[PDB]
Design a protein around this ligand. Structure first.
Ligand SMILES: COC(=O)c1cccc(-c2cccc(C(=O)O)c2)c1
Ligand SMILES: [Cl-]
Length: 242
C-alpha cells in the first residue's frame, strides 16, 4: 500500500534542504514517499489551514460566497498584497492571514473545535488563541493526514455542504493547462520550530488524480519557491506531468 522511494531525497539534498513528499495514486489506492517517518510527523499547518477554515466559514454563513468583499482594516502590514480588499479567491491566493483571523473569531472556539473533529483533521486540537492557533497553537497535522483530508474534500465527503466544498476547491485553483490541473494551498510556518514550508493539494489528469503533500525545512523565506519546484520535479520524475 505504501512504498518508500528514497531516491526523491536527491531533489531535496541538491538544494541543501531536507523534507518529505507524499503522493497518492487515487486509481490504484497506493501511496509513495521519500521518508515514511517524516511523512507521519505532525507540524503546524500554518496557511494550509485556510482550506478547512474556508469550508467552516462558508458552511456557517460567515462567508456568503466567493464574491463577498472583506475590506482591508486599514492597518499597514509588511506584505503589500494584504493591504487591500479581498474576496475568498484572492485571500487564498495571497494567504491573507488577517482575513482568516477574522473568520476564526466569528466562527468561535466551540464551532471550530467540533468542525475539525468532524473533519478528522490532524490532532483536532485548537488550544491557543482562536485567531492564531494554526500559526502558534497546539494544532498539528502530518503530510499523510493532509492527504486523507484532501481526499475527502475531492469526493465531497466532508461533513459540510457540497456547495461549500465546491467553492473551496474553486478557491484552491492554482494552475491549469491542457495537461493537468493543480488545486493546492501553500503554507509557511515560522513561529514554532522547526520552520517549514508546506504545499498540499492534488493534480487532476484526464483519467486519474494524484494527491500530494510536502513539507520542507525553511530556515529563511529565500527558499519558499522550492515548495512548488521540488514537488513538480518529483511529479516529473514519476511521469505524472510532462
Ligand atoms: C516571498 O514571501 C516572503 O518573503 C514572505 C515573508 C513572510 C511571510 C510570508 C507568507 C505568509 C503566509 C503564507 C505564505 C505562503 O507562501 O504560504 C507566505 C511570505
Ligand atoms: Cl474551478
Amino acid at each position: 500500500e505504501w512504498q518508500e522511494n528514497k531516491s526523491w531525497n536527491a531533489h531535496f539534498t541538491e538544494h541543501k534542504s531536507q523534507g518529505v513528499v507524499v503522493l497518492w495514486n487515487e486509481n490504484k489506492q497506493q501511496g509513495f514517499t521519500n521518508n515514511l517517518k517524516r511523512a507521519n510527523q505532525a507540524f503546524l499547518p500554518a496557511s494550509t489551514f485556510k482550506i478547512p477554515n474556508s469550508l467552516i466559514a462558508l458552511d456557517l454563513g460567515v462567508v456568503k460566497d466567493e464574491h463577498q468583499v472583506f475590506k482591508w482594516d486599514g492597518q499597514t502590514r509588511d506584505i503589500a498584497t494584504w493591504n487591500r480588499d479581498h474576496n475568498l479567491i484572492t485571500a487564498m491566493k495571497y494567504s491573507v492571514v488577517p482575513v482568516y483571523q477574522e473568520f476564526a473569531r466569528q466562527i468561535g472556539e466551540a464551532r471550530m473545535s467540533k468542525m475539525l473533529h468532524a473533519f478528522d483533521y490532524g490532532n483536532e486540537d485548537i488550544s491557543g488563541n482562536v485567531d492564531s492557533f494554526w500559526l502558534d497553537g497546539g494544532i498539528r497535522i502530518s503530510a499523510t493526514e493532509q492527504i486523507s483530508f484532501l481526499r475527502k474534500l475531492y469526493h465531497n465527503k466532508l461533513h459540510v455542504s457540497e456547495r461549500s466544498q465546491r467553492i473551496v476547491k474553486q478557491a484552491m485553483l492554482t494552475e491549469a493547462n491542457g495537461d493537468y490541473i493543480i488545486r493546492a494551498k501553500t503554507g509557511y510556518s515560522t513561529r514554532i520550530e522547526p520552520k517549514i514550508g508546506w504545499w498540499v493539494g492534488w493534480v487532476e489528469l484526464d483519467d486519474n488524480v494524484w494527491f500530494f503533500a510536502m513539507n520542507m525545512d525553511m530556515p529563511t523565506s529565500d527558499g519558499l519557491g522550492l515548495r512548488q519546484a521540488i514537488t513538480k520535479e518529483v511529479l516529473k520524475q514519476e511521469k505524472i506531468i510532462p
